[PDB]
């Protein structure tokens, strides 16, 4: 939701840690206009640290 | 040197997906649509 982001060889890099994931919010928020994962389901990161 | 076509073969079949993992001696022969995850995708194709 930020106002301006970086290009695509300029992006930036966001190191997260220590904080809660609620990917739960996201998903049924129908603000994407395409959702996929790679290797794991999205339901699963819940159960996952 | 037998079984292996050009392209796959495709006549052989086997379960990826499955809601709960089963029982020994408990086997599932059924082909229909089911649900490949916990997601609410009620088993149709899409939503991962």
Same mark, same amino acid.
């Given at each position: 939701?930020?106002?301006?982001? #970086?290009?695509? *060889? #300029? ?9 809660? #994931?609620? *990917?739960?919010? =996201? *998903? ?9 994962? *790679? ?5 699963? =990161?819940?159960?996952?640290? | 040197? !037998? ?12 379960? !990826?997906?499955?809601? /709960?993992? !089963? ?6 022969? /059924? ?6 995850? /916990? ?10």
């Amino acid at each position: 939701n930020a106002t301006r982001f #970086a290009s695509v *060889y #300029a992006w930036n890099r966001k190191r997260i840690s220590n904080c809660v #994931a609620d *990917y739960s919010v =996201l *998903y049924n928020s129908a603000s994407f206009s395409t959702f996929k994962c *790679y290797g794991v389901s999205p339901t699963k =990161l819940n159960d996952l640290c | 040197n !037998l079984d292996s076509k050009v392209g796959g073969n495709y006549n052989y079949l086997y379960r !990826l997906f499955r809601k /709960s993992n !089963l029982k020994p001696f408990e086997r599932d022969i /059924s082909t229909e649509i089911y649900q490949a995850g /916990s997601t609410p995708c009620n088993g149709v194709k899409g939503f991962n």
